[PDB]
Amino acid sequence: VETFAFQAEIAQLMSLIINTFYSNKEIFLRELISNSSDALDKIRYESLTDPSKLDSGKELHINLIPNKQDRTLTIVDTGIGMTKADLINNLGTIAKSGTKAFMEALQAGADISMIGQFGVGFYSAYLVAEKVTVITKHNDDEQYAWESSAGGSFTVRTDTGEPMGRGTKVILHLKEDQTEYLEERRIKEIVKKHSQFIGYPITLFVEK
Ligand SMILES: CC1(C)CC(=O)c2c(C(F)(F)F)nn(-c3ccc(C(N)=O)c(N[C@H]4CC[C@H](O)CC4)c3)c2C1
């Protein structure tokens, strides 16, 4: 397990998201599903010139898995997944420009629901989550586990749990006062009003 510091701009963005009073928190799910949809676009597009990239799984879908007892909401896709370089450097590098630009806008008057147009929608997960775990598998790399409870640091480590084949699992350890996002009626309402035009099956896993 390696520990890394966030870039100052990203760390600043996370502090803002965690400690700003913002009631329209449900937008986190639209942003995470948009991330999955982009990941699925990319693997499908690349498979058009190299069909062997789908040997790790041909189905392209998004699963939403709430867990009331663990107080976790998990978003699973079979998209392209992320490499070690993605998790530690490349995505952060791209995010720096959008993050800084996003924090300017937050002072021009723009509100938090706009985070998506800056390419940094993933970090909206910290509106509802005290800790975020990302399990991801790219065709050209091993399975890795990313985790952060904000505070300016994050960890990456090789994962040894069950293999995923290919794709990304985002595990939101929900805050105490945010368990409404574990209710199936609530999840269905958010999906239908923010993400009804996603080009892949979105499946809600009902708890038994
Ligand atoms: C690396 C992170 C842990 C922290 C991060 O900063 C970040 C960001 C960023 F804010 F930079 F935009 N985005 N982001 C993230 C999170 C889930 C996914 C998905 N569900 O696959 C994702 N998709 C691909 C889509 C196609 C791209 O070619 C590569 C990514 C990206 C993360 C996860």
Numbering used by the authors: 17 to 224
From the paper:
Heat shock protein 90 (Hsp90), as an evolutionarily conserved chaperone in eukaryotes, plays a vital role in cell differentiation, proliferation, and apoptosis by assisting more than 300 client protein proper folding or conformational maturation. Heat shock protein 90 contains four isoforms (Hsp90α, Hsp90β, Trap1, and Grp94), and in cytosol Hsp90 exists in α-α or β-β homologous dimer form, and every monomer consists of three domains. The N-terminal domain (Hsp90N), with ATP-hydrolase activity, contains an ATP-binding pocket that is responsible for ATP binding and hydrolysis to provide energy for client protein correct folding or conformation maturation, which is indispensable for the chaperone function of Hsp90. Hsp90N inhibitors could bind in the ATP-binding pocket to prevent ATP binding and then disable chaperone function of Hsp90.
Diffraction data were collected up to 2.14 Å resolution limit with Rfree = 0.24 and Rwork = 0.21. The asymmetric unit of the refined model included a protein monomer (residues 17–224) and 47 water molecules, as well as one SNX-2112 molecule in the ATP-binding pocket. The refinement results showed that continuous and strong electron density appears in the empty space of ATP-binding site of Hsp90N with a shape to well accommodate SNX-2112 molecule. SNX-2112 was perfectly sitting at the ATP-binding pocket to disable molecular chaperone activity of Hsp90 by blocking ATP binding, therefore suppressing cancer cells. SNX-2112 formed three hydrogen bonds with residue Y139 (2.7 Å), residue D93 (2.9 Å), and residue K58 (3.0 Å) of Hsp90N. Meanwhile, SNX-2112 also arranged a network of water-mediated hydrogen bonds with residues S52, D93, and T184. The special feature of SNX-2112 contained three fluorine atoms, and one of them formed a halogen bond (2.7 Å) with the carbonyl group on the main chain of residue G135. In addition, the side chain of residue F138 faced a parallel plan with the pyrazol ring of SNX-2112, for which π-π interaction contributed to their binding. SNX-2112 formed multiple hydrophobic interactions with residues M98, L103, L107, F138, Y139, W162, N51, A55, D93, and T184 of Hsp90N, which was responsible for the intense binding force between the ligand SNX-2112 and its target Hsp90N. The stoichiometry was determined to be 0.83 ± 0.01, indicating a 1:1 binding mode between target Hsp90N and ligand SNX-2112.
